[PDB]
Symmetry: C3
Subunit: 191 residues, 3 copies
């Protein structure tokens, strides 16, 4: 009871838009999912402690501070899952200056116990271009091969999640012009 779905992707791949369009379309049939953004759970604890003005400052903090707030947020979100189904928008790995940080390290992974881990992907081309069109959230404008490296290490981390807990790992394409098709696939997956 109470399903826990994790939705992941490098910044710019659009996992948030996918989650939101799928949830509003799930509610047309009375399938209620609550969206939880893990970075927002984290960003409220950080903003309480003075470590960050905004949320793009979090992947740059010392990784032991990152892991400390990540663990809190996983506990908090696990509690949210006791009340309703949740789709958790978060990361297979977070890119930090000191490397990729697993977003669900085994202790956090065990606390959420997701049923399905979704990887939202597209070509690094389209990601870089989406990142450059948004002068709101200031994201890594990195080379496309750096983007591909991230999507590469996201697959690796995510599949280890599946080896550890038995969750299925679903890859869904969210390509420029075809968001609707990513929603049909994610919707179909949650039934």
């Amino acid at each position: 009871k109470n399903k826990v779905v994790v939705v992941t992707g490098v910044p710019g791949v659009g996992g948030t838009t996918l989650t939101q369009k799928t949830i509003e379309k799930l509610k047309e049939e009375g399938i209620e999912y609550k969206m939880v953004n893990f970075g927002t759970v984290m960003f409220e604890v950080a903003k309480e402690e003075g470590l960050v003005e905004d949320r793009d400052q979090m992947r740059k903090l010392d990784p032991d501070t990152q892991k400390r707030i990540q663990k809190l947020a996983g506990r908090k979100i696990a509690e949210m899952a006791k009340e309703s189904n949740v789709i958790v928008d978060t990361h297979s790995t977070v890119k930090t200056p000191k490397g990729y940080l697993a977003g669900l390290p085994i202790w956090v992974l065990e606390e959420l116990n997701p049923d399905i881990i979704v990887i939202v992907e597209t070509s690094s081309d389209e990601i870089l271009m989406r990142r450059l069109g948004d002068a709101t959230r200031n994201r890594d404008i990195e080379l496309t091969s750096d983007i591909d490296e991230h999507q590469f290490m996201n697959r690796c981390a995510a599949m280890a999640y599946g080896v550890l807990t038995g969750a299925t790992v679903k890859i869904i394409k969210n390509r420029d012009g075809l968001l609707d098709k990513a929603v049909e696939e994610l919707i179909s997956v949650l039934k």
Copy 2:
């Protein structure tokens, strides 16, 4: 003392053929291995319970129902390894509608405790062409890149197995026209 070899590969890549041709050539030098097909252990429990007419319907079931039969099948096979050496024909990950499912999740992995995990690969081209040549076992006719996606994730899970158990992870190419050469590589490995 009871060696346990796990042989993996996407459908059509030819692990059953590699195993059968190797085991009979091993028996010419007096090295007895028994072939054990994980999907058949599962398919005997499923059909006993009414879940399936055939075995290509098994990757489509409830993944909670899969993992429950998966664990059983690992148990039956762990007992088989007490009596003889086994090459187990199975899957690093199984493609299911709700994503890739680890074939040796950590509870099944520790019950089998394989010494060597073999990965049989070829180009996504040659696999698809093999799938279309066979109206006996009806298989996933997917894009060649979905086939490449699968072989990518099979490598991730297998290296995770190797991190968890210390098993070596061996990649063998089983290429068209060169089945012969793939057997020589595997026979050599089992010494």
Copy 3:
């Protein structure tokens, strides 16, 4: 109690050279790190027992005779960390005739508990070319696609390490002619 940074890389890629140039330049800033070569600690226990004349003869021994000595060496290196910061030069995976053998299987990984895992990369072209220039440490002259297979699996193993411990996984390019740039990035990471 002090830092443990692990530096990994296929033979020929320059992890040993990178480590050393970084260690002496850190000492310009009064930052003392002790270099430790995982292969040398093993070969101190190994030639002590007669299994190898030289160190290229370790990826060639039976995979249970290695793992028998791999655990010993991780313990020695844990002891050094109580005394000084250590950068451990070792391998994400070791290529043996029986496959890739994880360099930090979970029991060794748990004893070292590295804070950061560095993967040193460049193109297999440049790596292969370096292996041919050296008639001193005689190395695997394998195809560039075999070198790529290896760098793939090193990444798979490395990210799984990061899932089990929370160590960040940093990818650093050590490109022909630009060793210095691979040194400033690692220096920058260690502050």
